[PDB]
Amino acid sequence: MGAAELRFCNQTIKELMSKKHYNYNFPFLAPVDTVALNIPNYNEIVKQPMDLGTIQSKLANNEYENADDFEKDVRLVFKNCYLFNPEGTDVNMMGHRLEAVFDKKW
Numbered sequence: 338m339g340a341a342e343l344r345f346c347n348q349t350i351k352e353l354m355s356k357k358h359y360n361y362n363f364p365f366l367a368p369v370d371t372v373a374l375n376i377p378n379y380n381e382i383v384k385q386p387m388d389l390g391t392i393q394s395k396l397a398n399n400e401y402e403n404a405d406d407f408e409k410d411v412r413l414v415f416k417n418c419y420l421f422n423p424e425g426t427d428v429n430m431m432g433h434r435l436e437a438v439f440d441k442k443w
């Protein structure tokens with residue numbers, strides 16, 4: 338990825354993970370802990386799990402060849418959120434509001 342595009346992806350993922358947005362990013366900072374959350378059906382429902390911490394790692398390890406691949410993974414976090422968490426639930430609302438932060442920056 339180009340240098341300026343890489344810098345912008347890094348700024349974007351750090352913005353999404355920052356404590357400034359803790360109230361709506363905390364469920365998405367690390368892979369879903371299906372044992373701690375008692376959700377064995379998460380792996381049966383969500384076939385391509387993704388989280389912000391994994392995206393940050395993939396970025397640092399040169400696994401996004403352009404910004405579009407980076408965006409696809411960010412969108413996947415929210416797609417999985419809306420699939421597993423029904424509309425109206427607390428985590429679903431957090432996904433909507435964090436994706437709005439991404440839309441504004443991106």
Ligand SMILES: Cc1ccc(Nc2c(-c3ccc(O)cc3)nc3c(C)cccn23)cc1
Nearest residue numbers: 363364365369374375376417418421422428
């Ligand atoms: C029985 C049940 C129902 C809903 C949830 N949602 C949920 C998720 C979650 C995040 C992303 C995702 O793609 C799927 C689930 N993260 C949490 C956390 C950190 C605390 C409490 C609930 N949480 C957990 C258990």
